[PDB]
Amino acid sequence: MAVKDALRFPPTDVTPIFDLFRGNFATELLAASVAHLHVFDILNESPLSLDELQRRLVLSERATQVLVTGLCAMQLLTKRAGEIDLTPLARNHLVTTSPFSVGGYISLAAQSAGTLALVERLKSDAMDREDSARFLTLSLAGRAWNVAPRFADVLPAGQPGKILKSSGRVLLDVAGGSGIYTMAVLQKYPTWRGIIFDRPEVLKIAAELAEQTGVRDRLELHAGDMWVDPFPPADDILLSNVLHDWDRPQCARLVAKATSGLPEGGRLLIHDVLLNSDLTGPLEIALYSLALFSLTEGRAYSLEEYRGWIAGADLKYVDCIPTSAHGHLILSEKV
Amino acid sequence: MAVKDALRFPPTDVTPIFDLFRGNFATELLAASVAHLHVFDILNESPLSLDELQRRLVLSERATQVLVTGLCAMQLLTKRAGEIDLTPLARNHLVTTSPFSVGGYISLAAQSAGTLALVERLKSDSARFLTLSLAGRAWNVAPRFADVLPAGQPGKILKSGRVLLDVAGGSGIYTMAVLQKYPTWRGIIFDRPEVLKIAAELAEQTGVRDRLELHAGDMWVDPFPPADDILLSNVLHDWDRPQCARLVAKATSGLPEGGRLLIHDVLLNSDLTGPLEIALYSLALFSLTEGRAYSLEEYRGWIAGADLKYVDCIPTSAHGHLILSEKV
Ligand SMILES: O=c1cc(-c2ccc(O)cc2)oc2cc(O)cc(O)c12
Ligand SMILES: O=c1cc(-c2ccc(O)cc2)oc2cc(O)cc(O)c12
């Protein structure tokens, strides 16, 4: 009887709380860059290409990108013509021989557990399994309840579906456990059907929430390994906060595999945050990217980067539509 | 021969770097407040007075004020006539039973070393390296400080320039800049012997060593030397309110006619609800010292309690303010 409403917009915008919550990564990247990696003293000598800086810092491409993007977003580095240089603000205040340096003050955090953890991550690049997966899934679910109403509101209907025998569409939600985004879409589109594809420990949460939102009869839950197990037939495939967990080659692989099974007129829906096109900001996404770098194999990506993978899978890019909490729905179509 | 200039303004303003650097205290205060102290679930029951909240959270007065000030500055609590309440933003997203709660996401940081340290600090409430670390802020701010310090009256101690006594503080850089601006003045740095070694070096570099004396002592119990002006720069925020009142009284007690007490510090607004940059810095001070950031009204309370006359408040840089008071 009672039905949880997944379409009502939240009464306030939670986004500033997420932005404040990332503040530690500003402190940690500052302390890592001043006191451990010598970034500012190195670049003060001369601007360097990204490849040159990678080499001089002895860091992976990914580690160098997230470091450079973070410091650019804090207005401390600048990107020319490819080269990376200090801004006057960094040159005057974060170079050790500047009379106005405050590097010693920043270095008061050099040995904090957070700074050391981030340095180790950069350089190296009591709960059981069920409780741990539930705890993490329910923690990310709070963001989904805030964003899924927007997401469902801005998702276009698309073509009549080709899987159900005018037909609704089948929406497959890959590694989007909680499945909340799909449940909102199914409340908006009563003729559609949804499929959540994820690990079994996560599907338990989806089963509960599908009952609460009253879409259980139009939702299937499939356990599977997204890299190797076949995706079920679907009109639309959603990758929501998935691709930023993965490094570049894995992103291209996942986009290709999802695309391979789409019918003509099927859609790949990428829902994620966006760095700007030269990976210099904005600040709140650059700090969130450091969190993703610390916890996963990926980072935040730009629209241009997503469009590279889309184009490599021979999909047609359609549109980019903001949701909330810095999310963007990138729509592409199988041709 | 060579003379280090202490009067040229820096070409850029370092202040935003300090603000970015305090970001960990935003994360830690959110995770402490959601996951350990249940601040929002408690206040959702009913607005509470500061004293009521201090009892419910089982915190000291000082811990409760740095917590409440931080959350007000993040637009999560509000003060309105003396009670503390949630804002809609907090009620909607930081109360656990709200359907739009993100409390579980914030709690992903609940067991970080930084969060746990702040919780322990809240609930429980070398010098060469440290002095040389704070010296960089002073090199940025001292030019502006010297620029805005008024010359005042002819001094009473030299028999005329004024004698500026710089109590604690550290490097003595602010006094060196004043001595470059006013060649007839003299300065005294009062601090621990280890700190005075740094002042001695910097006094040679800035060419004021001959007009600068280095006095070692304990500021609470040893006699201050005679001075026209006494500077407390980034000192009072290290101390709780009774110790602030004590130190202001002791400094005031030896001022002559025309003497001045110079307080150089950051300022919270008058109802201790912000601004955010100072509220996060206040959490750092709470974590490392016995004090917190204070408001102008709080400083004026101590000034008036010592029978000084409040004169003016002049911004310097890195959020500093020079609060100028006169012996009457
Ligand atoms: O895919 C994600 C995985 C995690 C994560 C978070 C904490 C852990 O101990 C392990 C993994 O956090 C996230 C946080 C986000 O805001 C977004 C994500 O996609 C993820
Ligand atoms: O009086 C101060 C003491 C300290 C401090 C800093 C680090 C420690 O391990 C111990 C004390 O930091 C500060 C930082 C400031 O920005 C301002 C201060 O007055 C202080």
Q: Residue A27 and residue B21: Cβ atoms within 8 Å?
A: yes
CB-based contact A22:A273 (threshold 8 Å) = no
- Going by C-alpha positions, the residue among A154, A197, A206 that lies closest to residue A178 is A206
Nearest-neighbour CA in chain B from A27: distance (Å): 5
d(CA B16, CA A94): 12
Domain end call among B73, B100, B125: B125
CB-based contact B66:B74 (threshold 8 Å) = no
Q: Residue B74 and residue A30: Cβ atoms within 8 Å?
A: no
Q: What are phi and psi of A329, to 5 degrees?
A: -95, 115
Tokens 């989007």 map to which residue?
Answer: A176
Q: How many CB atoms lie within 10 A of CB B80?
A: 9
Say how many Å lie between the first and final Cα of chain B, rounded: 42
Q: Which of A3, A12, A34, A324 to mutate to test the interface with B (most CBs of B within 10 A)?
A: A12
Q: What are phi and psi of B215, to 5 degrees?
A: -110, 130
Q: Which of B17, B39, B89 to mutate to test the interface with A (most CBs of A within 10 A)?
A: B17
Q: How far out from the chain centre does Cα A38 lie? A: 29
Q: What are phi and psi of B10, to 5 degrees?
A: -65, 150
B283 CA → ligand 1 middle, Å: 27
Q: Residue B23 and residue A22: Cβ atoms within 8 Å?
A: yes
- Going by C-alpha positions, the residue among A187, A327, A222, A218 that lies closest to residue A269 is A327
Tell whether ligand 2 has an atom less than 6 A from the beta carbon of residue B216. Answer: no
- Solved how? X-ray
Helix (H, G, I), strand (E, B) or coil at A97: coil
When computed from its CA atoms, the radius of gyration of chain B, rounded to whole angstroms, is: 22
| Whether residues A254 and A321 fall in one domain | yes
Q: How many CB atoms lie within 10 A of CB A249?
A: 8
CB-based contact B314:B321 (threshold 8 Å) = yes
Strand partners, A240: A271
Listed resolution, Å: 1.6
Nearest ligand to the C-alpha atom of residue A136: 1
Nearest-neighbour CA in chain A from B295: distance (Å): 24
| Whether residues A232 and A334 fall in one domain | yes
The answer to whether the peptide bond before residue B16 is cis (omega within 30 degrees of 0) is no
Q: Residue B104 and residue A142: Cβ atoms within 8 Å?
A: yes
Which residues touch B156 (CB under 8 Å, ≥6 apart)?
B228, B256, B257, B258, B259
Q: What are phi and psi of A209, to 5 degrees?
A: -70, -30
| Whether residues B314 and B175 fall in one domain | yes
- Going by C-alpha positions, the residue among A263, A203, A275 that lies closest to residue A236 is A263
According to DSSP, the β-strands at B48-49 and B83-86 are: antiparallel
Q: Which residues of A137-164 are buried (b: 16+ CB within 10 A; e: fewer)?
A: bebbbbbbbbbbbbbbeebeebbebbbe
d(CA A295, CA B105): 14
Tell whether ligand 1 has an atom less than 6 A from the beta carbon of residue A241. Answer: yes
Domain end call among A128, A147, A182: A128
According to DSSP, the β-strands at A219-223 and A193-198 are: parallel
| Whether residues A8 and A75 fall in one domain | no
d(CA A307, CA A303): 6
Nearest residue on chain A to B87, alpha-carbon basis: A12
Q: How far out from the chain centre does Cα A113 lie? A: 25
- The alpha helices in chain B, defined as continuous H runs, are 15-21, 23-31, 39-45, 50-57, 61-73, 88-93, 103-106, 113-124, 127-148, 173-181, 193-205, 241-253, 276-288, 296-305
| Whether residues A97 and A139 fall in one domain | no
| Whether residues B251 and B311 fall in one domain | yes
DSSP state of A181: H
| Whether residues A262 and A113 fall in one domain | no
Tokens 């001089």 map to which residue?
Answer: A56
> Which chain B positions have a beta carbon within 8 Å of A114's beta carbon?
24, 112-114
CB-based contact A118:A29 (threshold 8 Å) = yes
d(CA B217, CA B224): 9
- Going by C-alpha positions, the residue among A203, A48, A56 that lies closest to residue A130 is A203
CB-based contact B221:B148 (threshold 8 Å) = no
Break positions in chain B: residue before each gap, C to N over 2.5 angstroms = 80, 125, 159
Tell whether ligand 2 has an atom less than 6 A from the beta carbon of residue B85. Answer: no
Degrees, nearest 5: CA angle B119-B123-B125:
120
Domain end call among B95, B125, B155: B125
d(CA B275, CA A214): 45
- Going by C-alpha positions, the residue among A26, A20, A325, A283 that lies closest to residue B74 is A20
Q: Is A7 on the interface with B (CB under 8 A)?
A: no
The answer to whether the peptide bond before residue A160 is cis (omega within 30 degrees of 0) is no
Q: Which of A4, A24, A296 to mutate to test the interface with B (most CBs of B within 10 A)?
A: A24
Structure tokens belonging to residue A205 = 């949460």
| Whether residues A161 and A243 fall in one domain | yes
| Whether residues A90 and A141 fall in one domain | no
Helix (H, G, I), strand (E, B) or coil at A301: coil
Nearest ligand to the C-alpha atom of residue B237: 2
Structure tokens belonging to residue A57 = 């810092």
Q: Is B156 on the interface with A (CB under 8 A)?
A: no
| Whether residues B43 and B12 fall in one domain | no
Say how many Å lie between the first and final Cα of chain A, rounded: 42
Nearest ligand to the C-alpha atom of residue B291: 2
What's the longest Cα–Cα distance across chain A?
74
| Whether residues B157 and B106 fall in one domain | no
What residues make up the domain containing B242?
A: 2-22+126-328
Tell whether ligand 2 has an atom less than 6 A from the beta carbon of residue B233. Answer: no
Indicate the angle between helix axes B113-124 and B276-288, nearest 10 degrees: 70
Residues 123-152 on B with a CB inside 8 Å of A are 129, 132-137, 139-140
Residues 64-83 on B with a CB inside 8 Å of A are 74-76
CB-based contact B50:A50 (threshold 8 Å) = no
Structure tokens belonging to residue B152 = 């005042």
> Which chain A positions have a beta carbon within 8 Å of B12's beta carbon?
88-89, 92-93, 100
CB-based contact A296:A302 (threshold 8 Å) = no
Q: What are phi and psi of B171, to 5 degrees?
A: -50, -30
d(CA B30, CA A20): 9
What's the longest Cα–Cα distance across chain B?
74
According to DSSP, the β-strands at B48-49 and A170-174 are: unpaired
Q: How far out from the chain centre does Cα B128 lie? A: 20
DSSP state of B257: T
- The alpha helices in A155-268, defined as continuous H runs, are 180-188, 200-212, 248-260
Nearest ligand to the C-alpha atom of residue B126: 2
| Whether residues A289 and A307 fall in one domain | yes
Can you state the percent helix, strand and coil of chain B, rounding each to 5?
50, 15, 35
Q: Residue B140 and residue A100: Cβ atoms within 8 Å?
A: yes
When computed from its CA atoms, the radius of gyration of chain A, rounded to whole angstroms, is: 22
Q: Which residues of A58-82 are buried (b: 16+ CB within 10 A; e: fewer)?
A: ebeebbbbbbbbbbbbbbbbbbeee
Residue type, A246: W
Nearest-neighbour CA in chain A from B104: distance (Å): 4
Looking at the structure of chain A, the number of domains it has is: 2
Q: Is B25 on the interface with A (CB under 8 A)?
A: yes
Q: Pseudo-torsion of CA B141, B145, B147, B153, nearest 10°?
A: -170
